[PDB]
Design a protein around this ligand. Structure first.
Ligand code: 3PH
Ligand code: IOD
Ligand code: NA
Ligand code: NA
Length: 501
């Protein structure tokens, strides 16, 4: 399970070329594909195939969970932000409830993005460690060095999406060629119940079901695209509000393609490891090393393909991390400092921007190391952190956008309660992980070569519900206390803020 001779050279050369091009640069369909490219880091490459291989093909419902998300963002959140010409999405909060809510929302965005970028830095480290033969910590150090060179020197997404999706297609083609024909692969996956699209298991403990996707995944993708900062800023830069919607729908098509290719590569990966499954044989340690192992195993006759594909999947996600870190620094120095501080020359402010970029780089690397220590689940971990933090923020946004009677006390108390409950599940589900069989992990073979009351019912809910469980309560708490301290008469909101218009 190591690169080899022709693969190390290709990996090194491609990484050097990627860094050189990125720095040399530093010193409406394109945007649609850039939006998806953002969240197509190594996290998805390592998670979606593994989840599809383990839990079956129900993971395709994720696409639906994104589709229903985009529609909402297309027809419920895009008009409000776009028609108001908001410089920052969280400026809405300031115009709606108060500047304190703007501050809290910006802080939640910063923390959530920091954790998510830490996990996005962890995943490439996982790739490098699993494929080269370096301990997780030396690989994490190398990943941090490269990410900081990208960020603290100088900040194409269409190219990344195209190249990595073509890599997915090539992996799938080679795999299905090896296993015979596509009909044989489909029948083999069908024998072991890997083709189970129709899974309406009502219970919420099941990790992946129709309800779980349509609700939790929809709300999480909403709090990752609908009310995010970078995505909304990309929207508002377009024209006439039609180009924005077309960019959003093209982004949705790109996401559909990426996640469907990944969910099919997962099934190919399983059918490949039908017997002598690497996981319960000691060949790999966690169910996130599946994809690099598949890449190495299938292309054990092509001297170069592993290096090219993994170098791309590494450099593109490091670029994503640098972009997220720089956006974090920019929003901090635009929405929190400059409004607060009277006014400072263009030198001190760029120096503060560099300082915040560096600080966020270090904090994200530290979060990556913490994720490495705790365990795995780059996909699960990223969704967990993002949902857990940004869910109540999305609840605040939705309460402001669709409920007239809502004031600052309501939103703030709702955020407090939502973060409380969301972290309750986020931790109580980490101290007492749910059983592998309650999560519905499909069977496998390897012969071819509840202590507390709530750990069994409430901490076991699907990891896609956490954010939802936050958002909903934020709406229900904020709706309640707001109506207690006093309703907010609708004749106080001026321009279009409520969507009831
Ligand atoms: C500057 C500091 C700014 C403040 C940063 C700290 C605020 C956030 C604290 C974390 C609250 C949300 C945690 C959500 C994940 C829950 C969980 O257990 O999943 C682990 C999560 C993945 O979830 P899993 O796959 O289900 O375990 O992994 C992590 O991100 C590690 C948890 C780190 C949380 C502590 C904060 C570390 C910040 C360090 C910055 C440097 C100083
Ligand atoms: I995904
Ligand atoms: Na990602
Ligand atoms: Na994700």
């Amino acid at each position: 399970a190591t690169f080899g001779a022709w693969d190390y050279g290709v990996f090194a050369t491609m990484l050097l070329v990627s860094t050189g091009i990125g720095l040399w640069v530093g010193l409406a369909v394109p945007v649609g594909l850039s939006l998806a490219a953002s969240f197509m880091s190594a996290v998805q490459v390592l998670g979606v195939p593994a989840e599809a291989a383990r839990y079956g093909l129900k993971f395709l419902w994720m696409c639906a969970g994104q589709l229903l998300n985009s529609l909402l963002t297309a027809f419920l959140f895009l008009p409000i932000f776009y028609r108001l010409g908001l410089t920052s999405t969280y400026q809405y909060l300031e115009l709606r409830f108060s500047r304190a809510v703007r501050l809290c929302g910006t802080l939640q965005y910063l923390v959530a993005t920091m954790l998510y970028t830490g996990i996005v830095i962890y995943a490439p480290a996982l790739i490098l460690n699993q494929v080269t033969g370096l301990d997780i910590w030396a690989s994490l150090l190398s990943t941090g060095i490269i990410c900081t060179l990208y960020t603290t020197v100088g900040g194409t997404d269409v190219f990344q999406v195209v190249v990595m999706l073509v890599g997915f297609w090539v992996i799938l083609a080679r795999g299905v060629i090896l296993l015979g024909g596509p009909r044989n692969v489909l029948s083999l996956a069908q024998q072991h119940s890997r083709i189970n699209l129709m899974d309406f298991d009502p219970d919420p403990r099941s990790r992946y079901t129709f309800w779980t996707f349509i609700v939790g995944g929809t709300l999480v993708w909403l709090s990752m695209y609908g009310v995010n900062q970078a995505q909304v800023q990309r929207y508002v830069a377009c024209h006439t509000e039609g180009k924005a919607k077309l960019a959003l729908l093209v982004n949705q098509l790109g996401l559909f393609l990426i996640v469907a290719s990944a969910a099919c590569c997962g099934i190919v990966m399983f059918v490949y490891y039908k017997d002598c499954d690497p996981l319960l044989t000691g060949r790999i340690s966690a169910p996130d090393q599946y994809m690099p192992l598949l890449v190495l195993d299938i292309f054990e006759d092509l001297p170069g393909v592993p290096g090219l594909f993994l170098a791309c999947a590494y450099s593109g996600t490091l670029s994503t991390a640098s972009t997220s870190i720089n956006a974090m620094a920019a929003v901090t120095v635009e929405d929190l400092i400059k409004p607060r501080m009277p006014g400072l020359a263009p030198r001190k402010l760029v120096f503060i921007s560099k300082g915040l970029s560096f600080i966020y780089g270090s904090a994200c690397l530290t979060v990556a190391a913490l994720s490495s220590l705790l365990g795995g689940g780059v996909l699960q971990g990223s969704f967990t952190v993002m949902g857990v933090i940004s869910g109540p923020l999305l609840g605040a946004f939705t309460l402001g956008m669709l409920l007239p009677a809502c004031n600052t006390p309501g939103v703030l108390s709702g955020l407090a309660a939502g973060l409380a409950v969301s972290l309750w599940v986020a931790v109580g589900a980490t101290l007492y992980p749910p059983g592998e069989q309650t999560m519905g992990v499909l069977p496998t073979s390897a012969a071819g070569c509840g202590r507390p009351a709530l750990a069994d019912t409430f901490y076991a809910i699907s990891y896609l519900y956490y954010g939802a469980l936050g958002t909903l309560t934020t709406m229900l708490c904020g709706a309640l206390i707001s109506y207690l301290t006093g309703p907010t008469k609708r004749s106080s909101l001026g321009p279009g803020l409520l969507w009831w218009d």
